[PDB]
């Protein structure tokens, strides 16, 4: 490829990471051991301005166990997407803490995005748009609030991030 | 459930518990290689017997992962996360990241058997294991479980693992281990080697 951009997907279990991962494909490579366990990343290739870009996104296995924000959260990625569940107050409270720290420790040029999602349509909203937007603004980080009903803006956010990363190098 | 199905399930859960205990014991000993092997045996058995993490968790009520154990799990997690990403390069980004990520997922499975969703580990923040030691442990395990025909770019996978293990050990021998020198090994596809590596 002309480019390989590494994206980190940060979020707890059951908050809607699965919804965001629908914008990516499974890698088709396997061998015996990988077939038994699976992997924690997905991929997508796009052509942008005549160049081929591979996006590789890690929804890192076991991350929910280790919420001390160590370097694995803020080094070795071009973009970091942090997600909470709009139907779960504690999920938002947790993400405020993690994102504050990631923003503090990551290089300024790492692309960051906060996503509030309703991934289960049978659930009831709790976290106001304005509250989450105010938080994102306090850090100077883009914010996307989204529902599984329509993923157009999610798709848009990833395409924007890819173009921004490409430009910065 | 027929009686035979109940008896079989209980027997299988009891055996899976024993395998989990063995993995936890290896972890407690700081035996990186032994832990990865035991975690794999647990995963293989649960798959074979059609048991899920949720089935085994109640059986583990009187068991604990120690702060030391959690520190080792965190070190393995951080190293595997970093390595999977470092190993994704323009040369190749499928086989090496896949193998490393599978190791990470396998360790996560061990924890999921014990912990409910989003329950946090409680690592000893002062218990350090060397990242270079952890990485070699991961590589040794990958060498063991990689298919003999597996390749990373133009090199045999097992042979490239041996090559990277040796490179890390040479860094240790010369007091030259840091995140940068380790990253150079992790991201390498041996593109400058004079011969393509084979295992046998």
From Swiss-Prot, chain A:
Glycans are attached at residues 65, 67, 75, 104. The modification (Microbial infection) O-(2-cholinephosphoryl)serine is found at residue 72. It is an enzyme of class 3 (hydrolase). One of its GO terms (molecular function) is cadherin binding. Keywords: Acetylation, Autophagy, Cytoplasm, Endoplasmic reticulum, Endosome, ER-Golgi transport, Glycoprotein, Golgi apparatus, GTP-binding, Hydrolase, Isopeptide bond, Lipoprotein, Magnesium, Membrane, Metal-binding, Nucleotide-binding, Phosphoprotein, Prenylation, Protein transport, Transport, Ubl conjugation. GTP binds at residues 13-14, 16-19, 31, 36, 62, 117-118, 120, 148-149. Regulated by guanine nucleotide exchange factors (GEFs) which promote the exchange of bound GDP for free GTP. Regulated by GTPase activating proteins (GAPs) which increase the GTP hydrolysis activity. Inhibited by GDP dissociation inhibitors (GDIs). Transmembrane segments: none annotated. A motif (Switch 2) lies at residues 59-76. It catalyses: GTP + H2O = GDP + phosphate + H(+). Its cofactor is Mg(2+). GO terms for biological process: autophagosome assembly; autophagy; cell migration; COPII-coated vesicle cargo loading; defense response to bacterium; endocytosis; endoplasmic reticulum to Golgi vesicle-mediated transport; Golgi organization. It is found in: Golgi apparatus; Endoplasmic reticulum; Early endosome; Cytoplasm, Cytosol. Mg(2+) binds at residues 18, 36, 59. Switch 1, switch 2 and the interswitch regions are characteristic of Rab GTPases and mediate the interactions with Rab downstream effectors. The switch regions undergo conformational changes upon nucleotide binding which drive interaction with specific sets of effector proteins, with most effectors only binding to GTP-bound Rab. This is Ras-related protein Rab-1A. The lineage of its organism: Eukaryota, Metazoa, Chordata, Craniata, Vertebrata. The chain holds residues 8 to 176 of 205 of the full protein.
UniProtKB/Swiss-Prot annotation, chain B:
Belongs to the DrrA family. Virulence effector that plays a key role in hijacking the host vesicular trafficking by recruiting the small guanosine triphosphatase (GTPase) Rab1 to the cytosolic face of the Legionella-containing vacuole (LCVs). Acts as a GDP-GTP exchange factor (GEF) for the small GTPase Rab1 (RAB1A, RAB1B or RAB1C), thereby converting Rab1 to an active GTP-bound state, leading to the incorporation of Rab1 into LCVs. Also shows RabGDI displacement factor (GDF) activity; however, this probably represents a passive activity following the GEF activity. This is Multifunctional virulence effector protein DrrA. Residues 7-187 are annotated as: Rab1 guanine nucleotide exchange factor. GO terms for cellular component: extracellular region; host cell cytoplasmic vesicle; host cell cytoplasmic vesicle membrane; membrane. The keyword Hydrolase does not apply. Keywords: ATP-binding, Guanine-nucleotide releasing factor, Host cytoplasmic vesicle, Host membrane, Lipid-binding, Membrane, Multifunctional enzyme, Nucleotide-binding, Nucleotidyltransferase, Secreted, Transferase, Virulence. It is found in: Secreted; Host cytoplasmic vesicle membrane. GO terms for molecular function: AMPylase activity; ATP binding; guanyl-nucleotide exchange factor activity; phosphatidylinositol-4-phosphate binding; protein guanylyltransferase activity; small GTPase binding. The P4M (PtdIns(4)P-binding) region mediates binding to PtdIns(4)P and membrane attachment. The keyword Repeat does not apply. The gene is drrA. One of its GO terms (biological process) is protein adenylylation.
């Amino acid at each position: 490829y002309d480019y390989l951009f590494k994206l980190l997907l940060i979020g707890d279990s059951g908050v809607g990471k699965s919804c965001l991962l629908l914008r990516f494909a499974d890698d088709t490579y396997t061998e015996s051991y990988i077939s038994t366990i699976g992997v924690d990343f997905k991929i997508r290739t796009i052509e942008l301005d005549g160049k081929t870009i591979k996006l590789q996104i890690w929804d890192t296995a076991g991350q929910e166990r280790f919420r001390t924000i160590t370097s694995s959260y803020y080094r070795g990625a071009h973009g970091i997407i942090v997600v909470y569940d709009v139907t779960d107050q504690e999920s938002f409270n947790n993400v405020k803490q993690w994102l504050q720290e990631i923003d503090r420790y990551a290089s300024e040029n790492v692309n960051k995005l906060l996503v509030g999602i309703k991934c289960d349509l049978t659930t009831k909203k709790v976290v106001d748009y304005t509250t989450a937007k105010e938080f994102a603004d306090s850090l100077g980080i883009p914010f996307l609030e989204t529902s599984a009903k329509n993923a157009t803006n999610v798709e848009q956010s990833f395409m924007t991030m890819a173009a921004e990363i490409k430009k910065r190098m | 459930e027929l009686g035979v199905q109940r008896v079989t399930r209980i027997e299988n859960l009891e055996n899976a518990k024993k395998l989990w205990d063995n993995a936890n014991s290896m972890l407690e000993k700081g035996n990186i290689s032994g832990y990865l092997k035991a975690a794999n045996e647990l995963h293989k058995f649960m798959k074979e017997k059609n048991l899920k993490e949720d089935d085994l968790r109640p059986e583990l009520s009187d068991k604990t992962i120690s702060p030391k154990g959690y520190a080792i799990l965190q070190s393995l997690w951080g190293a595997a996360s970093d390595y999977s990403r470092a190993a994704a390069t323009l040369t190749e980004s499928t086989v090496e990241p896949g193998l490393v990520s599978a190791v990470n997922k396998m360790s996560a499975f061990f924890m999921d058997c014990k912990l409910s969703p989003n329950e946090r580990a409680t690592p000893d923040p002062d218990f350090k294991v060397g990242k270079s030691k952890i990485l070699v442990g991961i590589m040794q395990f990958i060498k063991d479980v990689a298919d003999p025909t597996s390749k990373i770019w133009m090199h045999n996978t097992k042979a490239l693992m041996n090559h990277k293990i040796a490179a890390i050990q040479k860094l240790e021998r010369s007091n030259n281990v840091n995140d940068e020198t380790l990253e150079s090994v992790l991201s390498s596809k041996g593109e400058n080697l004079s011969e393509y590596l084979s295992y046998k």
